[PDB]
Design a protein around this ligand. Structure first.
Ligand SMILES: *[C@@H]1O[C@H](CO)[C@@H](O[C@@H]2O[C@H](CO)[C@@H](O[C@@H]3O[C@H](CO[C@H]4O[C@H](CO)[C@@H](O)[C@H](O)[C@@H]4O)[C@@H](O)[C@H](O[C@H]4O[C@H](CO)[C@@H](O)[C@H](O)[C@@H]4O)[C@@H]3O)[C@H](O)[C@H]2NC(C)=O)[C@H](O)[C@H]1NC(C)=O
Ligand SMILES: *[C@@H]1O[C@H](CO)[C@@H](O[C@@H]2O[C@H](CO)[C@@H](O[C@@H]3O[C@H](CO[C@H]4O[C@H](CO)[C@@H](O)[C@H](O)[C@@H]4O)[C@@H](O)[C@H](O[C@H]4O[C@H](CO)[C@@H](O)[C@H](O)[C@@H]4O)[C@@H]3O)[C@H](O)[C@H]2NC(C)=O)[C@H](O)[C@H]1NC(C)=O
Ligand SMILES: *[C@@H]1O[C@H](CO)[C@@H](O[C@@H]2O[C@H](CO)[C@@H](O[C@@H]3O[C@H](CO[C@H]4O[C@H](CO)[C@@H](O)[C@H](O)[C@@H]4O)[C@@H](O)[C@H](O[C@H]4O[C@H](CO)[C@@H](O)[C@H](O)[C@@H]4O)[C@@H]3O)[C@H](O)[C@H]2NC(C)=O)[C@H](O)[C@H]1NC(C)=O
Ligand SMILES: *[C@@H]1O[C@H](CO)[C@@H](O[C@@H]2O[C@H](CO)[C@@H](O[C@@H]3O[C@H](CO)[C@@H](O)[C@H](O)[C@@H]3O)[C@H](O)[C@H]2NC(C)=O)[C@H](O)[C@H]1NC(C)=O
Lengths: 390, 390
């Protein structure tokens, strides 16, 4: 009984931790005999062991012990890694691992106050530096009365914290001018929380005369995105008079035409704003916010991409073909979107972009492991297969 | 010598004025006999006199005298008008005249604090409510020190103001975090000037460790509009460490292919910000802002549409065709963009949308005026033509 190696435990394609947190990653594979594990930089070069920063356990595991703020080296803490299992029969490398370590430092948050018409919906977002935006999210909003607000179901009450962390207020009025809100932020890696410094207030203006609807950007296009099985937000910010009614439509694929969105238990609209409770890849497409009014109307396009995890499967996982015959391999994948598709043999980065691999004629040199690679900007996945000779 | 009606002086499409200013619009026409001029709603009814708010001068001129806010009336000041010149042979309308009177009313502004890392450029936008965006723009920027700044030519040195009104700063450092800036907004109709209450200041983050590039939006697409001969701003908000090199590209029309942008005296790139002086229709197209560095890169694409003044020409201006013979009118227009091209006869909407219309068989009933209507989401224009029977 003998066969090549196969990846069982693959490190997460993206890993985030602080300097004080440290990290451990383990790629675990099985094969007969036991394959040897190695780590490599994105360019394929074998990793060196760096004292105090990056070191191989030799157990098939790798670690980044905690380190001083000054001990940070880019080539280590910010890099794309991967795991390589190899033996007599062949070799395979694990899906790309993004290692990102953030040395702990304090940040700040500001809230831009938005002028709003009486009766129209209003929203206050907590502005954050784009660089740490990955690692931090808004935990809650707190009123000057001391009461705090958190995201949830039940979109009633006029006060709701959306999944984006943006505080939404429907049907505003002068009564809402007194109170002022500030947002709480929670850093994922640290777990520490910080409350907004600047106190966001909402200034309402009593409209005089009729005025057509207006968007706060004037750009007719935006590109949204989101993970499947999560609350999604398609926002429309338009202040206008008198008191617009809003309608959202979905374009049919590659069509100038469109059909109206179905408002139901799952898909909900809050006064300007669509929400998808649990998203699926089918919801992806071009969206349109149509906001009308007595005087006139205005429109905004929104591009939505629903993300799904990537996973690959090669078929058959193994086979044996006689000399002078066609070899066949079929890569079956799941997840969306998908941009890159490629192949390789014991590494070597061979092939082209097709879901299928074929060798017109078997040859002695074609034995060993084969691997299918599919991935997008944000993710990656792989599957392994062996080829015996007959 | 008999002639059909023709326009000499035609009103401008867009007319905005303050309640305290008041305005007068004029329509002039020619042809023998001299046409009968009538001011009418977009809807075909004769405009009647209203006391003090709206008055028709005996010379064929419409006027809207000043008034107090309490005397504001929607059906007059918010109404869309048109001029109808008429003769025995037929009649023609003018370009759509949008009358909008703004009852003098207050606005405000707030400056979001721009979070930045050392060495990277900074951009302070003066935020303005969506409704007054068209009536208000930023004239100048005043610092904490009280020094004043304007959107001068010679893009160089540290501080710069862009034509779009954003305050730009390069090579930011801790020394520049102490200062606090205030924009200056000027209402175009009244000429009133407001100095922002909120004082924008920059939070400077000492770089610690390497950080992949990040955009302040996370949107991959915007869309910008600007007139020809005016300076346009394509801007990249990406923050990255080590300080990234940025480059702009322009997609080929309808292709995934791309080409680099030509830099010159006219087109000058400031940091991540691309500027196009004296824009022309040829500049319209999709653009791509690319930002890279030792860690990686990220990009966003921007759709640009350059407007051009709409003007229409009909050929032949006049003709005569016998019964049974075909009639032909070619409307050749100017400007950009182009949404619809329509046709009317004697002030009646008919037919289809084409640059050309032909009557396969002429009839006595086809005697009359024909006009070509071109439009976009912003502007409109008209052209007139005579048709006589042989
Ligand atoms: C709520 O608010 C919305 C948005 O303001 C309003 O919907 C808009 O209404 C306008 C006016 O009808 C629409 O503009 C129209 O677009 C049509 C579609 O364009 C196609 O065809 C042209 C060629 O003609 C192509 O260039 C283009 O790429 C498209 O393929 C045009 O055909 C229309 O022209 C017609 O209208 C006039 C009458 O006004 C006729 O006289 C012309 O001859 C011609 O038949 C027109 O330009 C706009 O597209 C609408 N929005 C959207 C998103 O589609 C609602 O009306 C409003 N509802 C209220 C107030 O109740
Ligand atoms: C269009 O609508 C607007 C309001 O929506 C009107 O604007 C108001 O006009 C009235 C006069 O008709 C103003 O009332 C007086 O204002 C004086 C101060 O003026 C300052 O503000 C203007 C801008 O508004 C500046 O340009 C100017 O330089 C000044 O800084 C006060 O001194 C007056 O007080 C005196 O008069 C009142 C009676 O009116 C007495 O009772 C007092 O005791 C005192 O003696 C007075 O308050 C008003 O300020 C204007 N407000 C705004 C917001 O504009 C326009 O007049 C209207 N257009 C018309 C009618 O054509
Ligand atoms: C500066 O930084 C920018 C990022 O802002 C870089 O720009 C992007 O670079 C990435 C690569 O890092 C490019 O992504 C590549 O796209 C190729 C083209 O995609 C087409 O083909 C796929 C099918 O595979 C279609 O789905 C798609 O619609 C396109 O039609 C892909 O083919 C590439 O995948 C390949 O790369 C790997 C190696 O990493 C191979 O092993 C694979 O087998 C495959 O051959 C890749 O994913 C992206 O297109 C770039 N965008 C732009 C706008 O440039 C710059 O490259 C960077 N500049 C410098 C100098 O560093
Ligand atoms: C990860 O990097 C951060 C940033 O350099 C380190 O944060 C700082 O670590 C020091 C360690 O002594 C903390 O000590 C503090 O010193 C200041 C005076 O400078 C004093 O006012 C405090 O009361 C405290 O004694 C400091 O608070 C801390 N700063 C932060 C977290 O913002 C961190 O130490 C690094 N991780 C490890 C494991 O070293």
């Amino acid at each position: 009984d003998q066969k090549g190696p196969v990846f069982l435990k693959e490190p997460t394609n993206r890993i985030d931790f602080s300097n004080s947190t440290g990290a451990e990653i383990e790629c675990k594979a099985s094969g007969n005999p036991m394959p040897e594990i190695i780590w490599i930089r994105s360019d394929g070069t074998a990793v060196g062991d760096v004292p105090g920063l990056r070191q191989i356990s030799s157990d098939g595991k790798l670690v980044f012990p905690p380190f001083r703020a000054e001990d940070y080296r880019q080539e280590v803490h910010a890099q794309v890694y991967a795991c390589l299992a190899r033996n007599q029969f062949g070799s395979i490398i694990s899906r790309d691992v993004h290692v990102r370590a953030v040395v702990n430092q304090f940040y700040g948050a500001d809230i831009l106050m938005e002028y709003v018409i009486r009766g129209n919906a209003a929203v206050l977002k907590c502005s954050i530096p784009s660089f740490v935006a990955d690692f931090v999210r808004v935990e809650s909003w707190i009123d000057e009365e001391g009461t705090e607000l958190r995201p949830s179901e039940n979109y009633d009450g006029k006060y709701l914290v959306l999944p984006s962390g943006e505080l939404h207020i429907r049907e505003v009025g002068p009564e809402d001018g007194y109170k002022s809100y500030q947002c709480r932020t929670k850093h994922r890696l640290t777990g520490e929380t910080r409350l907004s410094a600047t106190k966001g207030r909402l200034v309402i203006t009593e409209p005089v005369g009729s005025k057509a609807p207006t968007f706060a950007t004037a750009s007719k296009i935006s590109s949204l995105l989101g993970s499947s099985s999560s609350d999604i937000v398609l926002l429309c910010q338009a202040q206008a008079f008198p008191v617009p009614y809003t309608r959202w439509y979905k374009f049919i694929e590659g069509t100038t035409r469109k059909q109206a969105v179905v408002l139901n238990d799952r898909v909900k609209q809050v006064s300007g704003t669509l929400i998808i409770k649990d998203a699926v890849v089918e919801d992806s497409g071009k969206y349109l916010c149509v906001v009308n009014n007595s005087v006139g109307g205005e429109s905004v396009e929104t591009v939505l991409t629903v993300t799904a995890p990537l996973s690959a499967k090669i078929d058959p996982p193994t086979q044996t073909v006689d000399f002078g015959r066609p070899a066949v391999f079929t890569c079956q994948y799941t997840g969306n979107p998908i941009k890159t598709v490629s192949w390789m043999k014991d590494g070597k980065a061979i092939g082209h972009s097709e879901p299928v691999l074929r060798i017109e004629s078997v040859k002695k040199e074609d034995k060993g492991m084969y691997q299918c690679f599919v991935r997008n900007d944000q993710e990656s996945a792989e599957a392994s297969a062996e080829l015996k000779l007959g």
